[PDB]
Design an enzyme around this catalytic site. Structure first.
Site, mmCIF file in Angstrom:
data_model
loop_
_atom_site.group_PDB
_atom_site.id
_atom_site.type_symbol
_atom_site.label_atom_id
_atom_site.label_comp_id
_atom_site.label_asym_id
_atom_site.label_seq_id
_atom_site.Cartn_x
_atom_site.Cartn_y
_atom_site.Cartn_z
ATOM 1 N N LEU A 124 45.788 37.517 43.483
ATOM 2 C CA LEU A 124 44.306 37.282 43.505
ATOM 3 C C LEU A 124 43.802 36.287 42.430
ATOM 4 O O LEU A 124 42.955 35.566 43.052
ATOM 5 C CB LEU A 124 43.757 38.773 42.978
ATOM 6 C CG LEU A 124 42.350 38.696 42.996
ATOM 7 C CD1 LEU A 124 41.808 38.307 44.380
ATOM 8 C CD2 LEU A 124 41.630 40.123 42.676
ATOM 9 N N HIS A 125 44.650 36.269 41.171
ATOM 10 C CA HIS A 125 44.117 35.007 40.188
ATOM 11 C C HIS A 125 44.306 33.912 41.168
ATOM 12 O O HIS A 125 43.245 32.943 40.982
ATOM 13 C CB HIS A 125 45.056 35.164 39.179
ATOM 14 C CG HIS A 125 44.930 34.074 38.127
ATOM 15 N ND1 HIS A 125 43.660 33.663 37.720
ATOM 16 C CD2 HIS A 125 45.705 33.378 37.843
ATOM 17 C CE1 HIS A 125 43.890 32.417 36.989
ATOM 18 N NE2 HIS A 125 45.207 32.164 37.060
ATOM 19 N N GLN A 126 45.175 33.395 41.639
ATOM 20 C CA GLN A 126 45.657 32.364 42.401
ATOM 21 C C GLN A 126 44.417 32.056 43.562
ATOM 22 O O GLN A 126 43.868 30.917 43.398
ATOM 23 C CB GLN A 126 46.876 32.270 43.103
ATOM 24 C CG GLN A 126 48.014 32.423 42.088
ATOM 25 C CD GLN A 126 49.379 32.338 42.710
ATOM 26 O OE1 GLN A 126 49.825 31.955 43.638
ATOM 27 N NE2 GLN A 126 50.460 32.843 41.801
#
Length: 189
Positions: free
Chosen positions: A30-32
């Site tokens: 998700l961060h990516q």
RNA sequence: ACUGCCGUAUAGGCAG
């Protein structure tokens, strides 16, 4: 308010991977996605939070506009993960719900690290530094966390997450590239 | 329970 849509992602049980590891990986991807997406309009929460046990649970909720959610579902951040997850439909949230901040919390968990900084900022020695910053300065958080591997740093670090006090209404604010509050609230249900 | 950043700070905030 403006984030009246959400998507639920539930972890599938797996014999080779415990739930916590699938969650770390899901959160990391998700961060990516959020970095790539840019912006500060996508939030997360962990509806199956177990505060007593500091466990995040096996649900990750994405809070955003309906369009973002449909994009996030087709995007490559989920590659290799889809078989490990079950997805809800991007939906309008129920109402009413309380609102809350889902925030990263950090702790002075390493006195030696504060000491290297202090030396660097006051040209002090280790003995001076240790006199001024004792080992009791260490604080441990009683919060759920994910374990992440940074790409820019090389490090593996724990990212502790707090779901804040329930509020009746939300306040304006955005979210980091981990979907955590830098002021923004998400509906809690 | 890592590495660093802001801050006079051991207060308190922040980055991956």
């Amino acid at each position: 308010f403006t984030m009246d849509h959400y998507l639920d992602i539930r972890l599938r049980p797996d014999p080779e991977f415990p739930p916590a590891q699938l969650m770390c990986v899901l959160f990391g991807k998700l961060h990516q996605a959020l970095v790539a997406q840019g912006g500060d309009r996508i939030g997360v929460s962990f509806p199956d939070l177990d505060e007593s046990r500091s466990r995040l649970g096996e649900r990750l909720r994405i809070h955003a506009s309906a369009d973002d959610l449909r994009a996030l579902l087709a995007r490559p951040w989920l590659e290799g993960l889809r078989d490990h997850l079950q997805f809800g439909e991007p939906a309008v949230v129920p109402h009413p719900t309380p609102y809350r901040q889902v925030s990263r919390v950090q702790a002075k968990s390493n006195p030696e690290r504060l000491r290297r900084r202090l030396m660097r900022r006051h040209d002090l020695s280790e003995e001076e530094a240790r006199k001024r910053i004792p080992d009791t300065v260490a604080r441990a958080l009683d919060l759920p966390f994910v374990t992440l591997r940074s790409q820019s740093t090389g490090q593996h670090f724990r990212l502790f997450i707090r779901h804040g006090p329930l509020q009746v209404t939300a306040e304006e604010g955005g979210f980091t590239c981990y979907g955590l509050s830098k002021g923004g609230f998400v509906p809690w249900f």
